[PDB]
């Protein structure tokens, strides 16, 4: 159930910017948001009817199209007071503070965000 951004510590949340994706805090102008809607037995991310989260490997990230499966759409779920996002190869999607965004197999805080709305 979501319509905004994923926070990886009070330092910033995954969000949008012009024709690119980044992470930041609310301050200058409206922070362009993300829309999370359902797909099959999991959930997908979209915000322009033409872009879906996507990820390459090792530590590279990008955006693809609508799709049924996993990797492009995702399986994301709450976690006590936080949340976690997950694609194929049983990886979760990561944010290592200022280390930037990537993916990890583990599960704790390094790749678990909180959920901020509108």
UniProtKB/Swiss-Prot annotation:
MF-aspect GO terms: actin filament binding; actin monomer binding; fatty acid binding; lipid binding; protein-macromolecule adaptor activity
Main localization, broad class: cytoplasm
Membrane topology: Lipid-anchor
Superkingdom, natural source: Eukaryota
UniProt KW keywords: Actin-binding, Cell membrane, Cytoplasm, Disulfide bond, Lipoprotein, Membrane, Myristate, Phosphoprotein, Repeat
Sequence repeat start and end residues: 34-46, 74-86
The protein's name: Hisactophilin-1
2 X 13 AA approximate repeats: annotated span: 34-86
Described function: May act as an intracellular pH sensor that links chemotactic signals to responses in the microfilament system of the cells by nucleating actin polymerization or stabilizing the filaments.
Modification after translation, per record: Phosphorylated.
Stated family: Belongs to the hisactophilin family.
Cellular component GO terms, alphabetical: actin cytoskeleton; cortical cytoskeleton; cytosol; phagocytic vesicle; plasma membrane
GO annotation terms (biological process): actin filament polymerization; hyperosmotic response; response to acidic pH
Lipid positions (N-myristoyl glycine): 2
Subcellular location: Cytoplasm; Cell membrane
Subunit and partners: Homodimer or heterodimer of hatA and hatB, linked by a disulfide bond.
Contains several HHXH repeats: annotated span: 8-109
């Amino acid at each position: 159930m979501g319509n905004r951004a994923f926070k990886s510590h009070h330092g910033h949340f995954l969000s949008a910017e012009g024709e690119a994706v980044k992470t930041h805090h609310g301050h200058h102008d409206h922070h362009t948001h993300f829309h999370v809607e359902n797909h099959g037995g999991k959930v997908a991310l979209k915000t322009h009817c033409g872009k879906y989260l996507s990820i390459g490997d090792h530590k590279q990230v990008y955006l693809s199209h609508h799709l049924h499966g996993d990797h492009s759409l995702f399986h994301l779920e709450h976690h006590g007071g936080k949340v976690s996002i997950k694609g194929h190869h049983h990886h979760y999607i990561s944010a290592d503070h200022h280390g930037h965004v990537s993916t990890k197999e583990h599960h704790d805080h390094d790749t678990t965000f909180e959920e901020i709305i509108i």
